[PDB]
Amino acid sequence: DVVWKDVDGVSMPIPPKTHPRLYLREQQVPDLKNRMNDPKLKKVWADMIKMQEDWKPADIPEVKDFRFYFNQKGLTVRVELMALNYLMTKDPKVGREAITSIIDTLETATFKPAGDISRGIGLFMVTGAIVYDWCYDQLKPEEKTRFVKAFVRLAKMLECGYPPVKDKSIVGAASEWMIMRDLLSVGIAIYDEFPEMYNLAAGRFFKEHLVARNWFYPSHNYHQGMSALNVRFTNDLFALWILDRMGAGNVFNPGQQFILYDAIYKRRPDGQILAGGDVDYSRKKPKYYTMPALLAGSYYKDEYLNYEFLKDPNVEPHCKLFEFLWRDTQLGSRKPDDLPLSRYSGSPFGWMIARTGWGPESVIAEMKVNEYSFLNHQHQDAGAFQIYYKGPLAIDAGSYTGSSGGYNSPHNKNFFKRTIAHNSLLIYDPKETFSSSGYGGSDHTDFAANDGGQRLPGKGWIAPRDLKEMLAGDFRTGKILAQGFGPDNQTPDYTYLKGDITAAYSAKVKEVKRSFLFLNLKDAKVPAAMIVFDKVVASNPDFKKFWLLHSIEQPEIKGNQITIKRTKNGDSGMLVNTALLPDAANSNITSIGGKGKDFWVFGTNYTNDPKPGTDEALERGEWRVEITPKKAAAEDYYLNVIQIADNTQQKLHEVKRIDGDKVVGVQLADRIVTFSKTSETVDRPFGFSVVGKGTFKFVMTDLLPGTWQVLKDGKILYPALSAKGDDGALYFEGTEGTYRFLR
Amino acid sequence: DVVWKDVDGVSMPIPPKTHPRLYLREQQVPDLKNRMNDPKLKKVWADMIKMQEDWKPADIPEVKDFRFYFNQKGLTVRVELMALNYLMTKDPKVGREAITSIIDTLETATFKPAGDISRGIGLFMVTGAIVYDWCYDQLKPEEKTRFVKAFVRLAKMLECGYPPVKDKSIVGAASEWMIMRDLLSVGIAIYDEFPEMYNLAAGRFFKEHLVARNWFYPSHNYHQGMSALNVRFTNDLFALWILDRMGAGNVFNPGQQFILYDAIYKRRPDGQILAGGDVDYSRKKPKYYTMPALLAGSYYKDEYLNYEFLKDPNVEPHCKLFEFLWRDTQLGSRKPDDLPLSRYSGSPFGWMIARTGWGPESVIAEMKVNEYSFLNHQHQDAGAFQIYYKGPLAIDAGSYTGSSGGYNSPHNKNFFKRTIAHNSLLIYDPKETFSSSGYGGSDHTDFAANDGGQRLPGKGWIAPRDLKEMLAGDFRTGKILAQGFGPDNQTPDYTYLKGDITAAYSAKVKEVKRSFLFLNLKDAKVPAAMIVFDKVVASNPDFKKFWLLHSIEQPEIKGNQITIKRTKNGDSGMLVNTALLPDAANSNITSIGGKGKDFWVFGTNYTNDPKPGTDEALERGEWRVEITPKKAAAEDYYLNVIQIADNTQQKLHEVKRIDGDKVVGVQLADRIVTFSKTSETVDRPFGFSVVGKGTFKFVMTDLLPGTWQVLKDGKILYPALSAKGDDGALYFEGTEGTYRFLR
Numbered sequence A, B: 001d002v003v004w005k006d007v008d009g010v011s012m013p014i015p016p017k018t019h020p021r022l023y024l025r026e027q028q029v030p031d032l033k034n035r036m037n038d039p040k041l042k043k044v045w046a047d048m049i050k051m052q053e054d055w056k057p058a059d060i061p062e063v064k065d066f067r068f069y070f071n072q073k074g075l076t077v078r079v080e081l082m083a084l085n086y087l088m089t090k091d092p093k094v095g096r097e098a099i100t101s102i103i104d105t106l107e108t109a110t111f112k113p114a115g116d117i118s119r120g121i122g123l124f125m126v127t128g129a130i131v132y133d134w135c136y137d138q139l140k141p142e143e144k145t146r147f148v149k150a151f152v153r154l155a156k157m158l159e160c161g162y163p164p165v166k167d168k169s170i171v172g173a174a175s176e177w178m179i180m181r182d183l184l185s186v187g188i189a190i191y192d193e194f195p196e197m198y199n200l201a202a203g204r205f206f207k208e209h210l211v212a213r214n215w216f217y218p219s220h221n222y223h224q225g226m227s228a229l230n231v232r233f234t235n236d237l238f239a240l241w242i243l244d245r246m247g248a249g250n251v252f253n254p255g256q257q258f259i260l261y262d263a264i265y266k267r268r269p270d271g272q273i274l275a276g277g278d279v280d281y282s283r284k285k286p287k288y289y290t291m292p293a294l295l296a297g298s299y300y301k302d303e304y305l306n307y308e309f310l311k312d313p314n315v316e317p318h319c320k321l322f323e324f325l326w327r328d329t330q331l332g333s334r335k336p337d338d339l340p341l342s343r344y345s346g347s348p349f350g351w352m353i354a355r356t357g358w359g360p361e362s363v364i365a366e367m368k369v370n371e372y373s374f375l376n377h378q379h380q381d382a383g384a385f386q387i388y389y390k391g392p393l394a395i396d397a398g399s400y401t402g403s404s405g406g407y408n409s410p411h412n413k414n415f416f417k418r419t420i421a422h423n424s425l426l427i428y429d430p431k432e433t434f435s436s437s438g439y440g441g442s443d444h445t446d447f448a449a450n451d452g453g454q455r456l457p458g459k460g461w462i463a464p465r466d467l468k469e470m471l472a473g474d475f476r477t478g479k480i481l482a483q484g485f486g487p488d489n490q491t492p493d494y495t496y497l498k499g500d501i502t503a504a505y506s507a508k509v510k511e512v513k514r515s516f517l518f519l520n521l522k523d524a525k526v527p528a529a530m531i532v533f534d535k536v537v538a539s540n541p542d543f544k545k546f547w548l549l550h551s552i553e554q555p556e557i558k559g560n561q562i563t564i565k566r567t568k569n570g571d572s573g574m575l576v577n578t579a580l581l582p583d584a585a586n587s588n589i590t591s592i593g594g595k596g597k598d599f600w601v602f603g604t605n606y607t608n609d610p611k612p613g614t615d616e617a618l619e620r621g622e623w624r625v626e627i628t629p630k631k632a633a634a635e636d637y638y639l640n641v642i643q644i645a646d647n648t649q650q651k652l653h654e655v656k657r658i659d660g661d662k663v664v665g666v667q668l669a670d671r672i673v674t675f676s677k678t679s680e681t682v683d684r685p686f687g688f689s690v691v692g693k694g695t696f697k698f699v700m701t702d703l704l705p706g707t708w709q710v711l712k713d714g715k716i717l718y719p720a721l722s723a724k725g726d727d728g729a730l731y732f733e734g735t736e737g738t739y740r741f742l743r
């Protein structure tokens, strides 16, 4: 491998004194002949031969944005294949044709302003880098200088600038192609003649990008939502491949392999993915993570991810070369069916995804804390839950695009990215301000709507530059208190998550806690249920509290019982919530929605109608239920029990609130769940009563870790059970009677 | 109940303006008639009638120490029964007889200096308290003043002094009868006429005693060894009963109920208890915790503890009255047989006791970290292990008393209470001092022997006054890193404990870690095994490292195998330890022992031969094995595998050391166990190979909590398993092959 040296205060690999070193080294060159003859890889080579053809004037848009370049055609493809051919034959004149065909265009290329033009520019730099490195020994001394100058000229055009001192290192445009693929690629190629570019680009990557990613990688997830995952993660994977193939091995935390597992857990039976962050909706074509699946699966030799890639093994034209260079065509492939039904993502996330299966009958439930906010495409949705069953039931509302506009739309700023769009909690301080001066790249606004929701972190709702700035700022939004699933790893009866999300809100609250308990009921009539226990303490009793439940179609409210159904688009799922706390005498349950109220925010509706032929299921939503206390008080508690079944189901389980000693709980089906009445650690004896036939499965939470003793009807049932630290919980089986717990 | 009021800066209950309030209130008085007619409580009443008889001159010792008074006879018993009779009949002249019979003696009683005389003095005060309170309405005004004065005179004689400002509040004489029973009792009785005594005595209890006990109670154990448990804990239980019966409810952490469970777990099949702290040995009569079992069992209505009491329901004479007053004769009783085979005691202890059963064939293994030292009767034994099977095998060596002397003996100071007496670790710094100027009440010595062991905390090896001083001192000796047992709670295949005990030693070390893994092999030929993995980093490579294994009889050393047998006193157990690390080329294994070397400490043997007719089995020990590296180095590791079986078992389990990627481990029987090679958190992929037939049970420790993936032979075995925070472990079954773990 390469030598690692301290450059500008950081340990970094130095590009080896050898060519090629871009995307491969000498030793992989002889294998190109074999990859060429590989059946699997010859469609992709044929594709590249076809890309050599120039655009047809009748198809060339007037605005050539990133899509025009990413759909790479013509000269740049031709020179790349000459460079490749020179690699494989070393015929001097082939290397000459490559160099002479690209040099002049590289020097003079101009790019009219347009959507993400830096992507087109950067791709043009990559073509130059490929030739420079692959045909290096054919370069004349003057040609070397000309390339360098051209490379600098182009780099100055990028959003990150050159030096690359602009934008952000965890999110934003600089967390995409420009540094991790483009600048890096060129830096490596021209290092021997002009080391500055590498020193600067890789310097920022190693100092900032790598540090931030290695920080959250261990919890196997990403923070930009289910769409931005593609572009953002794809680029992490480019840096991974580029530096590895350069000879620096793997520079990322190996946990990087399992990040995409999240996308797998979130796949619906209808080809789409569970919502999260900036996303739009469609029902016309399945959603794919092709490139990340290719790069991650082929590097880490992961069959689950390769299965993901193989669903649609069709890369964007500009990435075809990298599939040809890097794809592992001998790697096996695995359906997700044998994967455990729940997966936990820890700090700084605190996320649980829980399923009842892997097919068309599976319930898919998401529960989130959010210890930190990464902003950009992430939403202020700490504490949010989302449930899908034969259709989206408890939904993550709003849409990224629509009639309102794009990223900068009032809809994004005032609803979509805000708490009120999610199944979370609102405490309304009428005098609270929400500074948004830093949000977006244009059409800025000083303040966003007051939604009674969570803070906008950063300098006017704008992401920090790096982890350094992030940790020193106000981006902490929560603290994971407890978590766990069991008793079986494979098919857990329950999935538990608790967070303190006080830090997500302003000083308008003193304490905001949420405990999720999802139940896999192992039952046909009623496959699943979710229990949500909330403690909210406002600094002013007069700050109105809201508990939100979003849906597509209009909910039915009958007393304490809310029914949500899917009846469209082939969806037939149903959701029924029993409101337990506050009690009947202190509970107001209302629904807001329909046209003019689908995106309602204390006065104003932030209209965002679907663009033509998009979101045919209206998953952006139209309705929400609001539960609010009748009486103004500082401290309040929410207790809600959601059941999930087919919409034709008439008889669900009856729910009982359990009132015991120091505990409040729920009993439905054959399950019992308890929480501390004040949602604090129970460090003293407590107890409650159970009435009902058969055997029940108990989950007791909020318990001081250590040895507990369980008595029933005055007699010892379990002489000693252990509550553990990660969940602070007890699980056991038992029948009806009066229970006592000793600690 | 009573009113709680804040006296001298603490919240504390005020004695009610009513009599009686000592040991009972009006409402329990009518029940005394029933208790009198209770069959179970008649023998105890008859006993008390017999105690009324005075000593016979031919039996009165010339030194009347605490035993002379605790074996209470004569006048004081008579007046107590007259007070009791007055309670039950309210015949004015009975109350008068009680008062007039005791008043003189109380005023003039003198006590010649002798062993723990404060115990006799305090008992005399209790008799006065009983009369004063129970016969209060018969007291003349001048008699009240006389009592008060007499009570003060007597209280000034106590070791704690009066005011009770002397000695210690977590250990020592002041953690016995004098405050928690005696001063407290008198204070309550005379509160209306002289509240100072209660204010002062209860003051210290509530400010100091209670705070310290409530601090460690939650982990259900005690810190003074298996003998001092009686007197020390009994007195905690007196304060419990006295304040409760006064009307203040339970002032202790309810965790108090389960402390004695420890004694139950440590009971051998021969009637004795596993060693720990200051203890002596006998094989003539079973060991009992009668009084603690009585008070704790009857107060908390615990059948397990009542069973303990009923084994020998024979209370010391001076405690007969309290059995009559407080014993629950209707309470049920339980053998320990249904109790889980392992029990964990957390902070500030970090102790695991693990068994294979509850009868004559049970192995009993103890594993200790020690996060703090309480001194007094506790030993400097952080990291120590002890194993019993059909006899004491890996022993806790030395003896409390013997030819050397008592508490102050050179044997106690230089061996018994020191690391070298235990199965732990030594790092010999030849220039280290061990200050002992504060140890003991007499015959003080400035310095104790250098045993290469653990520090002597406190001001010259003397306990702190209270928790306040303790936490601010140098009494921290360890940190629990991980713990756990499973997979089944009832009959765990493994019991795991890991601690960093660096703080137990001086700066002569940088790092000292010990991981215990006990295996219940569920096997007739070889019931159990213990694996011990040690990391030791010295500040000077030249500081000789020792790994200790103590035994009664002479060990056999054959290469890397050490065999220890019991062949005496009906004991037939055997221990075989396979030394894995250091390896053969860096391992020295020697034994020291026999006469002149049984208590050997780098130059000197601290002889302590048994007193006549004591320790028939010589459990004080005679031998130890020392394992030391051949080469001087700063960092060293010990890996030792102990198997346990009958001394007739000829063939044991073959032991294999597992050398893998980032991990070291053990394979024996059907068990696989691994540790981080540096005993650090493994946060990267790791692997190793397993060769052998059949299914194996795996326990991988030192892992980063999160989702792990297990492959073998290059294929997915387990797609996702969860290592939890408390144990940092993975557990699963598998057959032979090449294993790889991903995180």
Ligand SMILES: CC(=O)N[C@@H]1[C@@H](O)[C@H](O[C@@H]2O[C@H](C(=O)O)[C@@H](O[C@H]3O[C@H](CO)[C@@H](O[C@@H]4OC(C(=O)O)=C[C@H](O)[C@H]4O)[C@H](O)[C@H]3NC(C)=O)[C@H](O)[C@H]2O)[C@@H](CO)O[C@H]1O
Pocket: A065, A115, A116, A168, A171, A172, A173, A227, A228, A230, A231, A375, A376, A377, A407, A408, A438, A439, A440, A441, A442, A462, A463
């Ligand atoms: C740090 C920070 O907050 N930065 C903000 C920028 O993020 C933001 O820039 C806008 O970012 C969006 C974006 O979604 O990333 C750009 O949208 C364009 O690129 C995306 C992703 O490639 C396109 O989206 C998708 O289309 C498809 C598809 O057609 O199949 C696949 C993906 O799943 C889907 O998400 C999107 O169509 C592009 N839109 C264009 C070209 O108009 C914006 O271009 C970009 O401006 C700025 C905005 O002001 O604010 C920063 O603060």
Ligand SMILES: CC(=O)N[C@@H]1[C@@H](O)[C@H](O[C@@H]2O[C@H](C(=O)O)[C@@H](O[C@H]3O[C@H](CO)[C@@H](O[C@@H]4OC(C(=O)O)=C[C@H](O)[C@H]4O)[C@H](O)[C@H]3NC(C)=O)[C@H](O)[C@H]2O)[C@@H](CO)O[C@H]1O
Pocket: B115, B116, B168, B171, B172, B173, B227, B228, B231, B375, B376, B377, B407, B408, B438, B439, B440, B441, B442, B462, B463
């Ligand atoms: C804070 C501190 O460190 N204080 C030190 C004192 O603890 C210490 O005082 C000595 O403490 C011992 C002790 O063991 O507690 C006293 O021993 C006497 O009392 C104990 C308990 O009642 C007797 O022990 C029991 O004997 C029997 C039995 O008779 O069947 C069974 C029990 O299992 C066993 O524990 C012990 O026998 C008593 N002594 C005698 C001679 O009979 C000492 O009297 C007491 O001095 C002092 C010592 O200098 O040092 C302080 O620093």
Ligand SMILES: [Zn+2]
Pocket: A276, A277, A278, A379, A381, A396, A397, A416, A417, A421, A422
């Ligand atoms: Zn959202």
Ligand SMILES: [Zn+2]
Pocket: B276, B277, B278, B379, B381, B396, B397, B416, B417, B421, B422
């Ligand atoms: Zn000891």
